[model samples]
Target: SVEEYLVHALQGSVSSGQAHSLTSLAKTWAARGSRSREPSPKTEDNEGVLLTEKLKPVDYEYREEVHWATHQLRLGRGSFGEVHRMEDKQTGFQCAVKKVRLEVFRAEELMACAGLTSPRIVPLYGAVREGPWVNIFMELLEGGSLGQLVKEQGCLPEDRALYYLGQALEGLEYLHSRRILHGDVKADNVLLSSDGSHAALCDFGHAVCLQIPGTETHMAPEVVLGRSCDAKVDVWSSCCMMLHMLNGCHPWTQFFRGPLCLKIASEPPPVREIPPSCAPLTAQAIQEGLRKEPIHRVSAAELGGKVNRALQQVGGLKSPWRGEYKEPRHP
Candidate 1:
């Protein structure tokens, strides 16, 4: 099914300042095929006849018909790329596709991303190279970003927040377990699937498998001072996400908006007061994770357990704000 869809999707020539053989592109897709839920069908009808006929040569040069029918929906854009929603022409399955400019390719980041494979991490299906652009195909997520949720729904109930925190921690733990450090961990990077039953960590453009410490805003003070750091950076970012879920605003946004050196030197924001109904352990873990010093930060496993415990304490699997907070005010 997926193979059939891909065949039609790539009927047109993909020019990335260089000509790429259709066979090569298909082979690459085949190699990366294991990432998704199932392997793409290997059939002449799907890959051979369908794809070959669609990409037939026109005049002296091969011309690929760009079909927006399956590639038209634009999701959002960032400095590096734009994300689009696409439907497989054959399977009718939907997927989110990210197109990154060729200029943005960082070899180290790509290498690190290639090594990361976890259920909690967003799976990168395949990349289509087209004239100075690289399109990365990914699974479509139904639920919006954590940032979007907080902005629209205001602060989530403590239990809901903790539930999300636990999920995020599980993701980070998986990353750390691989000895990888997600240099950029933020509310905007956490994505939820359509069912809300799954959450994934995304945006591995800055991820590294080595032990390099990130900047100060989301980094522990020890990391800022050139000391060795581990997964604690993820813990701190996780704490920030928790704060946003609890307060509907980033605690260090103001200070973090400017230069990294200045932000780290500036006095950190005071912790927002937690609601009385919120579990004390959850609150404490968030506090410890957000601390400036790396040594004082908690581990991902510990934070994950703390949040899970808090969720259980508050009567698990229900909305934390189901009956507590009022409706959020929208702009």
Candidate 2:
């Protein structure tokens, strides 16, 4: 396994930097558990690692300042690491880089996204292990995350919300069909192109091979109930995201207070959070995806079909990508 190989490699080499608590690291690893599927299939070349313009030695040490010119701005931050924009000094090619501590790094992050050709999924350039960090390279989307868009625009119009939801559902369908689960699906994890016309799923850190846990508010009832989960979990999260888009607030945050896990498990799905002004088909599609019983919920593909139809029913994406600035509905 990659974890064993990485640990063994570290053991034979000189180590440096700060020490992390093994107990905390173990807790995270144990929570995620292991992949249920066979080892992830590799990309066309380089063992799922793509080559850049300036090819360096396989064992060459990577220094952020020396190899790539990283920007001062941070793209995103998570328990896993920090993401930043970088440019290849040699080729002047630009991309985004996620710097993860080697101790907490999981091979599944790369395995889940490597070699995937879908435009709805973010493109991974490659990864390199240096010192105590493993830096992951991926395409840079300047438009930022969908979460940022919602914060800026207050809330999206119905047709525009359905447009993005349809795209996200297509990505979910592709991942589910491959026997992979995104585990975490939220507006923050969805990236947009510079034009805001294209959307792609990003951040595969929580992705699992047919198995996972995710964010509390977006989590399905089955996940909150500690039951076995499947692809439908993403469907539920996606609809939760759709609700966030249309209402400009998370489904649970506006009504419930404190921790949400118990409420998510005990209460019915948060369909009442749906905006009253939403088109009939738009509301119906979200309701279908938010069904508490996984068996009763619609699949990503099924919900995607409904979303596309919903978009058309509401005159398509007629609103500007960024709606006129308005005070956030909830915040």
Candidate 3:
């Protein structure tokens, strides 16, 4: 009866474990429930230099004209800037807006951020660049960041970890294709959309002055060799994040007991540290990402495909929240 109810309630969506997880959750919210059974847009094409020219950046002249962010409230803050939850005055649509100091802003990073248009990547509405301020408007993720999920509940189930890991990997691949390095990939930087159906990559390349991974020995040695690394650095970070999702902590931190820099630079990866939940191929993927030499690391193009396939397969273990996961359209 519960199974039938779950199937019908979720609109026939069954997932790995065949709705068992949701069935149990169903009882808790039998009275509560547009949602998923269990688990589960295109970025516009724009020339790097020209995209901003078309979008009116928030500047001193038009700063007060932000009717789109009709209602505003602080959502987050960091050393560099603060984020606000904005509402469209006319439509009442809500979005997340990040406001930053303009002088310290980066052009390459900004163009890289605005030019990114991928479903796996967080949607970038546009940014405002006025005299000492820049405001970036984008999708407000209801599901929050992967790091938040992990923090609330450590070590996501193997299937869930793989599912999100796949999306993060695909997003990173998109960034690498553009010759950009988020140089940062962790549970925190990878966010989930509302309903927890999927995850997307964010951080807009503005991350600095804060400790990364949680990197150093955690990152590919080449990245620290002299700052001349390429997309492989991302591949390495992706692996760490994947492990973090599965292992509940940084893979290296969980394994190593001594100084990080010397060991990270000198020793080969301790493969045993990989999660047992990792499939043979997933383990191999992590192993490949940890290749001591940058030249030997797996390329993003190939890694993206592998992780994508892994995601679909892992997802197949159970029916998606809506039968099968479909990329949702954003306003």
Candidate 4:
């Protein structure tokens, strides 16, 4: 039943380019399946440019009128800026509004994301420049974020985990094919649609084009150490997200209290073994994803297939890992 849902959800939607991209990424991931391989050298250099030079503080006056829309609800703060939930006055469709401070708008990063058109990646509708704030309109996924679900429901079932992770890989594959890199790939950024059958990747604040080398974490060792990184950084982050989904905890959160840069530069804590209930392929995929070297990490497509195979091996829908905890429901 779960497989049926996943198949139905992903069907009749992807473009031919998307299909090719996923296949290419899968091949890359498969080639790097082992832990001793090195990443291939980048050929074309379309890495995005940094817009630090044009940075300026924003004036929030532009949104005064836009905020009056009926469905608008203020969400919370993010690394880039404040977020708001808004609805289209015409269609009554809901969407998320991300208001980024002008000072924080890295021109190149924003441009890189602007060119991406992945369904998994949140679509940036229109960007309006309001005095001090730049408002970005995006799709609002009502099912909430994977992080929120994990927090409320504890760990997810292996089938659900595979489903979500596979969707994430599908998205990552799209981004990588377009030469776009999601600098930050985590649970909080992966959003679920209303039916809970699809997961959409959101937040491009830290995203950059594939050619550009940026800050590291969720990236391979060489990339963090200043070597060029490509799509592998996203793979590493996806692995971290999968672990979090299975365990309901962040491995780095336990040990890293200071700057993320320094923490990633240092040796990561030992990899913990997955619970016996988890599939062996799932464990292997996570292990490869968590590897210190980016070159050693598998591609998103490869990880997706591996997870799919593991799900097949496990069979049936088992209860979510969080079923043990009983919390009072709010009326």
Candidate 5:
């Protein structure tokens, strides 16, 4: 609906700015196309135009039109859509935008991503829609995704790994408290702040405000079984991410190297071993988080505290670590 109004605005008042191809502006939605149980698209009086009021307004704003030259670079691309790094020609504010088909975005994304304001969580600048595309505007995290950083440099120092893990935990805790389930918890979803001083969680395309069920290479074993699961799913994935930081490989390797597949099919997922380099208590805690039973893991808030306290003991935690405590606060 926002796009239709934007489509009209571009034809009329947007009488400004350079032109960008309809295709350039883009499917994170494609991931859950079949099973999403969210409400149907909002039906409005003026068609898509009336739904414009549903947008958070000042908090959720859009451009009449945009120019390709205005974009500095393409951050990344996939079947869902492309992300662009852009500079506001008027204010010079730098940000990233995720675009998809005009009909692709759901009400949950507009409401969830835009309104969230936790300190450790990545802040969304806002969202918009154009003639044939929908645009999501967010603060550009220059440090790049944690997955890219790790692939570029296999593994991480103990202190640095724990530090980033702690940062992500805080954001995850915030989301879970708000009843939001960030279905994706791999490194790529954790982004670095531009100054590289700390980490922020991003890419909520796979996020669910309520619980969801499914299995992923990085998913919890319960999810793999299509059984009862919850925020603990994130904990399982986070441990996998933690191991990747320490092992420089994937969590599913157990399945390939042994009959771990048969083991998973028959019983609760046993805790995958962590490197000996991991602290005894920290590793124990991560194992607890990885319990096949969702009821076994600590709350995300509790895990965050455990992470920060453990990281506190490690002296050489890296600079890019978001040093501030930034405890959870409203919004």
Candidate 6:
């Protein structure tokens, strides 16, 4: 009976369409990828110009009325800003806005992703500074986040997890090539498009240029140990996300009792958490990503290919967006 269930689970919708569209989207950013590997002197000037056209005083007044007219509903609050849903009064266009205090605002939040055209990275619609506040605008993704999806569905089916993971890896590949690090690479920072067929990385408040630390639970051993890190850090976090998708909880939280930094630094990688039901390639890919040594970890591009293959091995994203739920493994 269990064998029959696994067999039935392998039957679902094809991912060729999603995969093809993503491939096409990749074409546009291919040019951008080549240059990040080279040291360019124009980096500073380019970042400043990404969000050109600072709203003049009168334009600022107009924009304010547009945003202020709506009863702005708070979306979420982060360390730097409060996210809210807002609509333009003149054009009636709707977007999510993060209002940050000028003093705490960091350029990297926008600079890290500005001018980037990857479909997996959320689009920035410029920002305007009005008095002590800076409003960062971006397109609103209505399908919520992968974190929210997991909360509602308990966990993702194998093929669906691979599909989304592959997409996220592609984003990381692009960013890593650009010498940018997502820093935080959990499901909560990953948003889904309206139909749930597309995913994009968001919230660059913690994103950094090549070198940084991120969430403790997802942090690599080197990060916890205070060793230098690189693009491989995102690979580690991405695997943690894969474990979260498979097990319905973060790796350490379900097992460890106290702060994770010490455990992450001292214990072995969390490969044991991979679900037994996963295909061999899926398990192997995750293990490679979770390797303790940053040099041993797979690059985002490499892991993306592996995850794509793993998805194919699992029968290509058969589960419906909000399919039958499984009980979460841990609270």
**Which regions of candidate 5 fall more than 4 Å away from where they truly are?**
1-70, 102-104, 211-215, 254-270, 316-331
Candidate 5 lowest-lDDT run of ten: 44-53
lDDT, candidate 3, 1-331, per-residue tens: 8565644543222122222333232222322221332331142111111122223323212242554442445665544557777764544556777776544444433444554578888766655433334566677887777877776665676567667777777787777766677766778777786678778887754332111323453577765555456667777777777777666677656456766666667667746667665667667777887776768888777776676566565564353322222221111
Please give the lDDT score for candidate 4: 0.60
What residue pairs are clashing in model 5? Answer: 1-48, 26-99, 26-100, 27-80, 27-81, 117-331, 198-322
The residue-level lDDT of candidate 6 at 293 comes to 98
**Residue range 1-331, candidate 2, lDDT tens digits:** 7555554443322222111222122233333334353453442111112344342322433456765668878998866779898887666788998987656676666666776779899977767544445677889999999999998898887887899999999999999888888988999999998889999998877888773565778999998888888899999999999988888888888788969998998888898888788889998999999999999999999999999999989998888877596554664
lDDT of each: 0.60, 0.76, 0.58, 0.60, 0.60, 0.73
Per-residue accuracy of model 5 over 202-276 as CA lDDT, tens digit each? 766656656442225576767767687678878778877887776667665644545344555565544544766
lDDT top scorer: 2
User: In model 1, what is the error at residue 44, expressed in angstroms?
Assistant: 27
Model 5 accuracy (lDDT, Cα): 0.60
True-structure lDDT of candidate 6: 0.73
For model 2, the stretches where C-alpha displacement exceeds 4 angstroms are 1-48, 51-61
Looking at candidate 2, the ten consecutive residues that score lowest on lDDT are: 14-23
Quality of model 1 by C-alpha lDDT: 0.60
What TM-score does model 5 achieve against the real structure? 0.72
Cα shift from native, residue 137, model 2 (Å): 0.2
Per-residue lDDT of candidate 4, residues 1-331 (tens digit): 6544543333322212222232222222223233453454552111111111111112221232443242445665656667777654434555677766545555443444453677777765444443334555566677778878888876677777777888889998888787877877888888887768678887765677654323233445655577677788888788777867777666556555645665666776226635556777878877877777767778888887887777777774455433554232121
In the range 133-221, model 6's lDDT, one tens digit per residue, is 46676778888889889888888888889999999999999998889888889998898987899999988776778544547789999
TM-score-best of 2 and 3: 2
Best by TM-score: 2
lDDT by residue for model 1 (50-130), tens: 121222222222211332223665666655667778654434556676766545544333333443466777765444544
lDDT score, candidate 3, position 258: 60
- Candidate 1 residue pairs that clash: 12-64, 13-64, 15-131, 16-131, 142-194, 221-292
Backbone clashes in model 2, listed as residue pairs: none
Candidate with more favorable, higher lDDT: 3 or 4: 4
